[model samples]
Target: TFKMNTAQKAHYEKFINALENELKTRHIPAGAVIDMLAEINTEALALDYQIVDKKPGTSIAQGTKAAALRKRFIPKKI
Candidate 1:
């Protein structure tokens, strides 16, 4: 439900594709991962809508979205 800008949607699709590939390489079922990511994205979009609508406490959703963006990257810690 997230009305992502075209660039964001393109980036997200690439990301989710990578995640699915990783799971496939690990011999794990990827349908669940794909499904979950889609669900989370939908939720994030809903949050975005809430923010646009000026619903109460939507700021928290914005924070979560920001954190989610950061979390999307997996840094290789040395």
Candidate 2:
């Protein structure tokens, strides 16, 4: 098993419990839970403002311009 700190363990346990509850209460299959997790993960990445960065020569200002339009001034895509 993977070792986890106190907070990490708590979160993992809580999330698993919630997922199981959703399965039982909603009569959703385990695979559905996995799919839901995937969708939520995509939303989390979007929330984190992850994006692709183009090279300076390939695009204007090294693709930082698009990030600036999204209010992200940093150089990293993640």
Candidate 3:
């Protein structure tokens, strides 16, 4: 048997349990839904975002924009 980490083991059990129930409920076999969600994680890894570069003023600009927006939306005490 393949050894899995804690998280992997939890998810493995979760999927197997859910799939087993789903198969019985739908009167279908486990093999049918095996490939249904096969590619569930392929797209996510393909487009993973890595913050490679940031403009020098990015943080300052963002902070100014956030403060300005907050000031506009917050109601002043009458």
Candidate 4:
């Protein structure tokens, strides 16, 4: 569904891992957080958005967190 380079993959995945660590301390449940872990991994790979909590949502799951991660996947905006 996508074509990410080795470097881009590193950036994106590292960012996700960062999110995972910080998110572990977030308010959501343990299961959901880890759930969203892989969720964001897959979704962000596809590269996609939504506000999540305000309305309630990943990168593909499409939420605020995922939106933030999108920047890592695409650091340069054109």
Candidate 3, residue 27: Cα displacement in angstroms equals 3.8
lDDT of each: 0.40, 0.37, 0.32, 0.46
lDDT of 1 by residue, 1-78 (tens): 145555555555565455555544344233554555456556545434211212212221212233343454322211
Give, for candidate 2, the lowest lDDT window spanning 10 residues: 55-64
Winner of 1 and 3 under lDDT: 1
Cα displacement (angstroms), candidate 2, residue 32, comes to: 2.5
Q: If candidate 3 were superposed on the true structure by all CA atoms, what would the RMSD be?
A: 23.4
Q: Model 3: clashing residue pairs?
A: none
Query: Would you give me the overall lDDT of model 4?
Result: 0.46
Give the number of colliding residue pairs in candidate 1. 1
Candidate 3: lDDT of 23? 42
Score candidate 4 by TM-score against the native: 0.35
Per-residue alpha-carbon lDDT of model 4 for 1-78, expressed as tens digits?
Answer: 045456555656666556645655555554564565566545554543211222223223323365554543343211
Tens-digit lDDT string for candidate 2 (14-40): 544454444343444446534655654
lDDT of 3: 0.32
| Candidate 3, superposed: residue stretches over 4 Å from native | 29-35, 39-78
* Candidate 3 lDDT tens digits, 1-78: 134345443443454455445544344333432333344223223333111112212221212232332232221111
Point out where model 4 deviates above 4 Å. Answer: 28-78
- For model 1, the superposed segments whose C-alpha errors exceed 4 Å read 27-78
Which residue pairs of candidate 2 clash? none
Order the candidates by TM-score, highest first: 3, 2, 4, 1
